[PDB]
């Protein structure tokens, strides 16, 4: 019926769907459909692909596979069973194509390092750098700068140079680095039950906890090995100053893009509940401490290991106090009052830190002006969701959905009491909500076994399902919006390549601005939705 | 036939037979079909009580052997013929390269 329906393209593709359009909208061709198989069908082996895609065996698979790997679009492992030989298993890389999915706000990450050089081709320079770096995947300043012209100013060219370090940009990607975290927890969970020097036969507990402990502490430096090591930072060659190790291949570490994009959201939450001035103080206050907060890195092994009715807590509370403690000494006791506009006498203007009270910050060593951190984010994140259904379901929806938050599993009779309106409204702004999930239902039978009109109903939250009703936001228009970008490319499909290789006509000029402002809208959307989506996937 | 001793019973024909139309055609009808779809059973059309449904021919019995007529052909008549339009104009492309 009319095909403008747009159901096939719509409903039946969750999760996986985003990827195989992204790569399709990005790499495309055969290079895409492989990942579509790879996500959907799980871990997969080189030969086994060809039994399905019909992709001309060991041709596309190999070529497109490495075509992904330098862009790290796959998770990569190889090993052998006890029989012998060897085999390779794969996955869809991490968040992976995610790197592509932003790439614009990764362009915006200039603004942080943008300081000390403003309104320059130096801007355009480092932009050209990064937009070449992600596109080309792994880079080396030796091969890149080598391809870059000679007879210019080396330490002036490199832009980053002494900057390559910062928090973001790049790190060596080393071997098992992008070997999947979950599985390297298994390989490292060897060596411990694997090596038990016949300690005692009794108490597998002494075998167990020690293993996990050994598994934890040995894992610690594993992610910290790439985190920072001076092999990059320290080197200072002859006739020069401190250099990186351009001998090494590096790739953008998205964790400090996680942190960076996120701290902006922590702002826009704070830029509400305080005054714009002290807000700005909070705005730069993160810039110093936005380094060491694990943030989207802290979940880490929260994936891959069975949780516990206890040990899961001993994992939580560990993340609660940790860096608020040791990096707490890296965190803000007395700031430099870095730049600031406020002016004249600037010090008590700084004492305003206490003006932040609820619902975040506002904890310290007793009376040095300071903020909690590793515990902050947990007591911060949980309350980052804010209004996710405002100007979508109507404001009336908030008040009771907010009310359902305070108490729990509450019945509409007393919802009609605490909250208030003619029931004629509740049965809309509530019932209309439940279709979008959130509230769900509790129900209990009364004076019946279980029946139709023989019981009472209660309403609850289950914020998991709530906080999960917005992962449709992934499948939502990040589904459609990206099509919009693609399926319109066919309007000028013959005109596009004409306009690219031409640099005329009335109708050519006619729809240029049309399709273009069109685009700039579709990516404006993508930026907005992206900014919202920045929350629910982690933190 | 399979190691375990079973069969003849609603449970019996679920011993081996992959055909879910006959396992549908026999005893439990509805839920052989539903179960069959939920696990997306492939069910190649093979046996007799299977084919008589689709009404195609039968694998066993008279339907056991395809029958064919000989063409009585002389492959001496199968050699192509041309005056080699190709061969003459070929040598114009052999130079300057």
């Amino acid at each position: 019926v009319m095909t403008i329906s747009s159901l096939e393209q719509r409903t039946l593709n969750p999760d996986l769907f985003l990827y195989k359009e992204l790569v399709k909208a990005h790499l495309g061709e055969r290079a895409a459909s492989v990942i579509g198989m790879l996500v959907a069908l799980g871990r997969l082996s080189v030969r086994e692909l060809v039994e399905k895609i019909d992709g001309m065996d060991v041709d596309s698979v190999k070529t497109t596979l490495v075509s992904l790997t330098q862009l790290r679009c796959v998770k990569y492992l190889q090993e052998t069973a006890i029989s012998g030989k060897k085999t390779t298993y794969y996955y869809y890389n991490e968040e992976g194509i995610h790197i592509l999915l932003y790439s614009g706000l990764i362009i915006d990450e200039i603004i942080t390092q943008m300081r000390v050089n403003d309104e320059e081709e130096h801007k355009q320079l480092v932009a050209e750098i990064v937009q070449n770096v992600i596109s080309l995947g792994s880079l080396t300043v030796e091969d890149y700068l080598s391809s870059v012209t000679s007879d210019s100013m080396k330490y002036t060219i490199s832009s980053l140079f002494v900057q390559l370090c910062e928090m973001g940009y790049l790190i060596q990607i080393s071997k098992l680095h992008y070997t999947p975290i979950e599985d390297l927890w298994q390989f490292l969970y060897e060596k411990h039950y694997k090596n038990i020097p016949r300690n005692s036969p009794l108490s597998d507990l002494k075998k167990r906890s020690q293993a996990k402990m050994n598994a934890k502490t040995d894992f610690a430096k594993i992610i910290n090995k790439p985190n920072e090591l001076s092999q990059i930072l320290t080197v200072d060659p002859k006739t020069s100053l401190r250099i990186v190790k351009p001998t090494v291949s590096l790739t953008i570490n998205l964790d400090r893009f996680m942190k960076g994009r996120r701290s902006k959201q922590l702002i826009n939450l704070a830029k509400t509940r305080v005054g714009s001035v002290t807000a700005q103080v909070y705005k730069i206050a993160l810039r110093l401490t936005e380094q060491k907060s694990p943030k989207i890195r802290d979940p880490l092994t929260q994936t891959g290991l069975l949780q516990d009715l206890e040990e899961a807590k001993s994992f939580q509370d560990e993340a609660e106090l940790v860096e608020e403690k040791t990096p707490g000494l890296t965190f803000n006791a007395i700031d430099l009052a870095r730049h600031l506009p406020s002016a004249s006498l600037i010090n008590s203007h700084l004492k305003i830190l206490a003006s932040s009270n609820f619902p975040f910050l506002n904890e310290t060593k007793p009376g040095v002006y300071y903020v909690p951190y590793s515990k902050l984010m947990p007591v911060l994140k949980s309350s980052v969701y804010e209004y996710v259904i405002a100007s979508t379901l109507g404001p009336s929806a908030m008040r009771l959905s907010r009310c359902i938050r305070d108490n729990k599993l509450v019945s509409e009779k007393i919802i009609n009491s605490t909250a208030l309106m003619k029931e004629k409204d509740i049965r809309s702004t509530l019932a209309s909500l439940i279709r979008y999930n959130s509230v769900e239902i509790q129900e209990v039978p009364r004076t019946a076994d279980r029946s139709a009109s023989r019981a009472v109903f209660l309403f609850r939250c289950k914020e998991t399902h709530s906080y999960n009703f917005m992962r449709q936001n992934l499948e939502w228009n990040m589904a459609n919006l990206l099509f919009k970008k693609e399926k319109l490319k066919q309007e000028n499909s013959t005109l596009l390549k004409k306009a690219n290789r031409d640099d005329l006509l009335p109708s050519e000029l006619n729809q240029l601005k049309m399709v273009n402002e069109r685009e700039l809208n579709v990516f404006a959307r993508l930026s907005r939705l992206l900014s919202l989506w920045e929350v629910f996937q982690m933190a | 036939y399979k190691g375990e001793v079973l069969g003849i019973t609603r449970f019996g024909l679920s011993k081996m037979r992959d055909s879910v139309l006959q396992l549908a055609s026999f005893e439990k009808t509805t839920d052989h079909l539903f179960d069959a779809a939920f696990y997306m059973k492939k069910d190649a059309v093979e046996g007799v009580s299977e084919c008589i449904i689709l009404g195609q021919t039968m694998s066993i019995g008279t339907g056991s052997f395809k029958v064919v007529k000989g063409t009585n052909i002389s492959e001496k008549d199968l050699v192509p013929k041309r005056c080699l339009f190709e061969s003459l104009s070929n040598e114009a492309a052999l130079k300057a390269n």
Partner: protein, 107 residues
């Protein structure tokens, strides 16, 4: 092979088979009294070799599977200690037209 006496504990069987390069083979003492192959009915069983299989599967031009199967453990199998995917040539005898043989595989 060792044997049980009376009890058989799923504790033991929970992880019994811990040796991939080798195996273990377990009997319950009640199950060994008279050897089954020696009984009356059970016809003589022969375990043909690896390569001896290939000859067979060439005679009838057959893949693996698609054969009459003996479920491992079968009383006979354990006594004869078949492994996964072997072929026991069974020589049976019944007076109909005479003696003959059929083959079974261990699945």
């Amino acid at each position: 092979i060792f044997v049980y006496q009376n009890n058989i504990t799923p504790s033991a069987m929970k992880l019994v088979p811990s040796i991939p390069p080798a195996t273990i083979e377990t009997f319950n003492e009640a199950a060994l009294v008279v050897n089954i192959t020696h009984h009356e009915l059970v016809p003589k069983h022969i375990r043909l070799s690896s390569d001896e299989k290939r000859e067979l599967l060439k005679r009838y031009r057959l893949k693996e599977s698609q054969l009459p199967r003996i479920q491992r453990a079968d009383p006979v199998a354990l006594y004869l200690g078949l492994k996964r995917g072997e072929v026991v040539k069974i020589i049976r005898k019944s007076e109909t037209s005479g003696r003959y043989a059929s083959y079974r595989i261990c699945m």
